[PDB]
């Protein structure tokens, strides 16, 4: 889905539309022998919230060879820790140190 | 009896997982393990293909 720069100036105050953002972190680069390019893509919109919110990990592919690809995250040391019950009634952590 | 709450076999949970695969990134090494090595750590492997 693609929107226009004229509709972004006439949209009603309380009507929330969705506009998708392209990731494209893992994408194989072109081969050595292929036609070149001439003055390409111009991007017009940018989020400043910022949007990156819910991600356990991202791009689980290995970059050649034993290293992480640039800008890849792993799961946090919190969703991998089963604690113990309280001295009475609810869940507590490890704890630390 | 009054029976306020009903019982269930397995719990659900409020927070679940989602994924977006890339159907062109396949490793050429078909690994293998035992059956009890499979069961405990099984469906979690097929959520992080």
């Amino acid at each position: 889905q693609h929107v226009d720069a004229e509709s972004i100036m006439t949209a009603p105050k309380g009507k929330l539309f969705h506009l998708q953002f392209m990731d494209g972190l893992l994408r194989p680069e072109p081969s050595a022998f292929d036609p070149p390019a001439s003055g390409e893509d111009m991007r017009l919109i940018y989020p400043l919230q910022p949007i990156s919110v819910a991600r356990s990990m991202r791009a689980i592919v290995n970059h050649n060879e034993v290293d992480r690809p640039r800008g890849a995250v792993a799961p946090s040391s919190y969703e991998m820790d089963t604690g113990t019950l309280s001295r009475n009634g609810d869940l507590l952590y490890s704890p630390v140190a | 009896l009054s029976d306020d709450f009903k019982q269930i076999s397995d719990p659900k949970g409020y927070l679940t997982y989602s994924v977006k695969y890339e159907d062109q990134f396949t490793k050429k090494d078909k690994l293998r393990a035992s059956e009890a090595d499979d069961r405990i750590v099984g469906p979690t492997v097929n959520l992080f293909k």
Binding site: L26, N62 | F25
Partner: peptide, 27 residues
């Protein structure tokens, strides 16, 4: 079962030309 015999074998060799794959490996 009746008469004791003798057989022979030779380890086989199997190879095909390197096939083409369309799937990529690393980033």
């Amino acid at each position: 079962a009746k008469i004791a015999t003798a057989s022979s074998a030779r380890q086989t060799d199997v190879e095909k030309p390197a096939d083409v794959t369309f799937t990529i490996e690393n980033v």
